Write a protein that binds this ligand. Structure first.
Ligand SMILES: *[C@@H]1O[C@H](CO)[C@@H](O)[C@H](O)[C@H]1NC(C)=O
Ligand SMILES: *[C@@H]1O[C@H](CO)[C@@H](O)[C@H](O)[C@H]1NC(C)=O
Ligand SMILES: *[C@@H]1O[C@H](CO)[C@@H](O)[C@H](O)[C@H]1NC(C)=O
Length: 494
């Protein structure tokens, strides 16, 4: 029912007055991203990173034929909600027939698993993990750059997503769905047997990227070797922390090695105070860039069951929203694709370093490009405020399309990334659905690792964050709009 260009059909206050109505429109159009040759390959059930859309028409043109376990995790998390019978996930997957959404998720995940297993057979050296892959043909291949290279961070995200999906499928008591869950449990369980050998160097050091001698050789072939790429380790509180937990619970590490994981991580967990103009001080967890993307872990594991953690991450959103108000930015910041050059149709590059410099490890930042998915952590705390920010960016010229929100816009409104990706779109969807931490905590409790998670993560956070300021500072609403400088809405979405 909703118009493609629904964002400017609402006022800001109307979004706050009824977030659910607005979200219902959001989910409908976000759902249109979920099509063959747009966001995934229906032949092998594998994600594509996304696709370019035509500068003028806003229709799919040039797909990204590659993806990674990180995008897989967004797709899988959605399917976890869909198979559990979530009405919102159904709005996304199957709006004209909600009752079919579980079956669609089940079918694709069946097809997907087959593809994962063919990849494992052909490339056993990955030990059941996924590199960046080409998904445009029936069988997966590593992208050229990712031959014999496997990232811990991305796989950590996928593994907890699959963990959630398994629980969701089994919660249905549908024997078909339970059988599917058990096959996925086998896939997931295999990674437990290889994780430490592939990614754990020792003394609490976990490879960010592991270099494989030869991906064609089995994990324990007499010639096979694994080594960390350089001295980049998963040692910080951002997305890589999901993989830390994988090693801890399932990797077969000693108690001394588990202690070493958290000890080596401790110096990267830091309390800092945001304070600009009359906003703050607000005590936050120091970010890498304080890109929204860095908070991803809270959607996969029940971090927010711990009050000190919930309070620290709530503070993040006080800082994030109000920072944009005080610096007069009509959106918020996250790692994102740069604008499209209209003459070529090509994205001009990728902007990793977009966040909030004053509360970041990396202070050298590009802040000319804003993105709707920057709201996903705000959405977890306050759907209304999250969606108000989302709306403010989506009303920018060309920032809605027939597949939902557009990747990104310049904050001065002189350029747009004419692109769709899972990262810029379905991150937000998964935040709207409340993450999968609920499903995960159920399975964690059943497998008696929940109490360990809570004890450990409360200890680590409570040791650093002792004297919170700014907890009285309300979330801020957008005060500036994206300038209209002559860009024209897509002809299929105006
Ligand atoms: C992956 O391949 C290895 C080695 O051929 C095999 O032992 C393992 O069972 C496979 N993984 C799964 C989940 O079937
Ligand atoms: C990697 O192992 C495969 C499988 O035996 C072998 O055929 C291939 O030549 C190896 N690659 C290199 C560069 O040694
Ligand atoms: C993004 O594009 C702008 C021009 O629109 C350019 O000045 C900037 O350096 C680009 N950044 C990246 C990281 O590609």
């Amino acid at each position: 029912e909703p118009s493609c260009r629904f964002a400017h059909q609402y006022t800001q206050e109307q979004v706050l007055q009824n977030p659910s109505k607005f979200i219902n429109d959001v989910l409908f159009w976000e759902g249109k991203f979920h099509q063959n040759n747009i966001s995934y390959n229906s032949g092998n059930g594998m994600s594509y990173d996304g696709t370019n859309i035509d500068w003028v028409t806003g229709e799919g043109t040039v797909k990204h034929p590659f993806s990674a376990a990180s995008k897989e995790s967004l797709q899988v998390m959605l399917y976890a909600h869909a198979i559990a019978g979530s009405a919102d996930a159904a709005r996304f997957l199957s709006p004209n027939n909600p009752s079919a959404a579980p079956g669609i998720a089940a079918s694709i995940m069946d097809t997907k698993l087959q593809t994962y297993l063919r990849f494992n057979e052909t490339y056993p050296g990955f030990g059941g993990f996924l590199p960046w892959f080409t998904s445009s043909s029936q069988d997966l291949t590593p992208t050229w750059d990712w031959n014999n290279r496997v990232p811990g961070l991305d796989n950590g995200e996928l593994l907890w997503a699959v963990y959630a999906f398994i629980q969701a499928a089994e919660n249905t008591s549908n024997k078909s769905f339970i059988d599917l869950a058990k096959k996925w449990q086998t896939w997931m369980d295999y990674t437990k047997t290889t994780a430490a050998h592939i990614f754990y160097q020792g003394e609490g050091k976990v490879c960010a990227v592991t270099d494989i001698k030869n991906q064609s050789l089995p994990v324990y072939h007499p010639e096979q070797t694994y080594a960390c790429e350089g001295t980049s380790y998963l040692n910080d509180p951002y997305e890589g922390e999901l993989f830390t937990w994988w090693l801890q619970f399932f990797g077969g590490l000693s108690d001394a090695d588990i202690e070493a994981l958290w000890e080596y991580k401790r110096p990267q967990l830091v309390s800092v105070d945001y304070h600009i103009g009359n906003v703050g001080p607000i005590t936050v967890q120091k970010g890498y860039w304080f890109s929204s993307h860095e908070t991803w872990k809270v959607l996969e594991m029940p971090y927010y069951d711990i009050d000190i953690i919930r309070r620290v991450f709530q503070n993040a959103e006080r800082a994030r929203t109000c920072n944009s108000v005080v610096t007069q930015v009509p959106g918020m910041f996250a790692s994102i694709n740069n604008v499209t050059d209209p003459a070529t149709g090509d994205v001009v590059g990728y902007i990793s370093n977009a966040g909030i410099p004053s509360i970041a490890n990396q202070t050298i930042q590009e802040l000319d490009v804003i993105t709707p998915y920057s709201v996903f952590p705000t959405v977890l705390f306050d759907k209304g405020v999250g969606m108000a920010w989302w709306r403010n960016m989506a009303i920018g010229k060309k920032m809605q399309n027939i597949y939902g929100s557009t990747e990104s816009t310049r904050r001065d409104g002189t350029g747009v990334s004419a692109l769709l990706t899972w990262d810029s779109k379905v991150s937000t969807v998964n935040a709207i659905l409340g993450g999968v931490s609920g499903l995960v905590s159920q399975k964690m409790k059943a497998e008696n690792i929940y109490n360990t998670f809570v004890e450990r993560i409360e200890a680590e956070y409570s040791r650093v964050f002792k004297n919170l300021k700014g907890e009285h500072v309300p979330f801020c609403l957008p005060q500036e709009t994206v300038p209209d400088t002559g860009l024209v809405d897509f002809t299929t979405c105006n």
